[PDB]
């Protein structure tokens, strides 16, 4: 079918913090969420046949994320996501990330696009990326931790085209993310 969907919120998340992911085209679309809490859901259309989807669990526990193309589930859907309770000491909203390799584009043929990640005002947590292009090919991003809570990371496009980078701290998608290039 015409529908791809990936990202942090199909695996994990934290309570009362939006579990997020991406859905791409390749009829009319739909989602539903069986879980221990009333989840609230929204697909923010980016314009480009892809849309930011976020739901809001209010209970620790496991939730089943059905994405549905027509009449019936996406390929791997339902996805099954274990939502963790918000640690007292984790601030994803307070993570910042930036640089040439997160723009519009300018990102050229085969060539490195830089970018950093400042997690210092962000408490304790596991960092995890999610990157696929405009065809659901995975994107490799070596991430080199400097030590001080900041991170050198880069990748190499091949295309005058769009690559999508999702960023999770403590399994929670980060502000300004998912970045589209």
């Amino acid at each position: 079918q015409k529908v791809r969907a990936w990202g942090p919120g199909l695996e994990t998340g934290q309570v009362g913090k939006s579990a997020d992911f991406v859905v791409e085209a390749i009829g009319t679309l739909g989602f539903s969420i069986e879980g221990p809490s009333q989840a609230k859901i929204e697909c923010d259309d980016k314009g480009d046949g892809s849309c930011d989807v976020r739901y809001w669990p209010t209970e620790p526990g496991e939730y089943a994320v059905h994405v549905i193309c027509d009449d019936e589930d996406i390929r791997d859907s339902p996805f099954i996501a274990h939502i963790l309770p918000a640690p007292p000491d984790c601030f994803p909203d307070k993570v910042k990330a930036f640089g040439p390799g997160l723009e519009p584009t300018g990102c050229i043929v085969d060539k490195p696009a830089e970018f950093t990640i400042d997690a210092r005002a962000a408490g304790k947590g596991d960092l995890k990326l999610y990157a696929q292009d405009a065809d659901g090919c995975p994107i490799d991003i070596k991430v080199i931790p400097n030590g001080d809570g900041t991170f050198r990371c880069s990748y190499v496009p091949t295309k005058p085209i769009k690559h999508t980078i999702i960023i999770s701290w403590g399994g929670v998608n980060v502000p300004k993310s998912p970045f589209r290039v």
Binding site: T28, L29, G30, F31, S32, I33, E34, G35, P36, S37, Q38, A39, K40, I41, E42, C43, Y55
Partner: peptide, 9 residues
């Protein structure tokens, strides 16, 4: 309690 929420377009 089990709950189911859902959206379509």
């Amino acid at each position: 309690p089990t709950f189911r929420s859902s959206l379509f377009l």
